[PDB]
């Protein structure tokens, strides 16, 4: 399995 959840805002900057 896998817990990752790719949310678009996480791929912006600054973190």
């Amino acid at each position, epitope marked *: *399995g*896998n*817990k*990752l*959840q*790719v*949310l*678009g*805002k996480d*791929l*912006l900057l600054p973190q």
Partner: antibody
Framework: QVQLVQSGAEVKKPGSSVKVSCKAS????????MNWVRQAPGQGLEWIGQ????????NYNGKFKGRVTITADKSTSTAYMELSSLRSEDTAVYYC???????????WGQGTTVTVSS | DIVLTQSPDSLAVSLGERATISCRAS??????????MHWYQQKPGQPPKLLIK???NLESGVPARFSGSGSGTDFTLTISSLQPEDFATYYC?????????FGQGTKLEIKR
């Protein structure tokens, strides 16, 4: 053969609590986020919250925080949603749905009708 | 909270013709060349079914007459050569942030 099977229709009076079940089959229940999505006429689809059954982490819609509790039993592979202080606006069909790492809901239960009325 | 507004609310289109359904987000949901918007199909008595992921990527088994497009705030689902099984309610969903939100749905009906 992912299958999500929900508990049966429920009828409740205002102010009560309802607890819907969702039995999963064919995947590692502990490793996928389980969401609650409700559907009432004219109200589109509403994402209630989610729980990651592995470690019990939860994320809620602020519209419902402090009124809904989402839980998960790993031994029975069952997720739950308690909607407390029910009101005549919570009448809806309640779905459970498995989601994947790209945050789409790829398998859905058959839905549970919840009627709240005096 | 992101608000998704679809247009139209309902649409009647003849068999064999082309339907266009729109979803507008209250903020951009695109970054790095990917749009975090998805489409579902729902028929009465059934849960929604995932049709298109990331605005334009058809799920397995979805016929080629379906397509999706758009970026930023505006997205479109298009079905050419409509078949009887295509008449349904369609919902958009973003995966930009928590909480996940959905469009209010567009009901596609048969024009006769």
């Amino acid at each position: 053969q992912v299958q999500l099977v929900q508990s049966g229709a429920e009828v409740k009076k205002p102010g009560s609590s309802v607890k819907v079940s969702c039995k999963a089959s064919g995947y590692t229940f502990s490793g996928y986020w389980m969401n609650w999505v409700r559907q009432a006429p004219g109200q589109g689809l509403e994402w209630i919250g989610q729980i990651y059954p592995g470690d019990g982490d939860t994320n809620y819609n602020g519209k419902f925080k402090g009124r809904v509790t989402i839980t998960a039993d790993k031994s029975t592979s069952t997720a739950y949603m308690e909607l407390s202080s029910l009101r005549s606006e919570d009448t809806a069909v309640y779905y459970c749905a498995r989601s994947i790492t790209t945050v789409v809901l790829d398998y859905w239960g058959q839905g549970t009708t919840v009627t709240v009325s005096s | 909270d992101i608000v998704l507004t679809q247009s139209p609310d309902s649409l009647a289109v003849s068999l064999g013709e082309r339907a266009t359904i729109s979803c507008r987000a209250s903020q951009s949901v695109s970054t790095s060349g990917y749009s975090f918007m998805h489409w579902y199909q729902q028929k009465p008595g059934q849960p929604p079914k995932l049709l298109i992921k990331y605005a334009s990527n058809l799920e397995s088994g979805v016929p080629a007459r379906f397509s999706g497009s758009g970026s930023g705030t505006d997205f479109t689902l298009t079905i050419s050569s409509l078949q009887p099984e295509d008449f349904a309610t369609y919902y958009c969903q973003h995966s930009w942030e928590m909480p996940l939100t959905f469009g209010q749905g567009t009901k596609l009906e048969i024009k006769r």
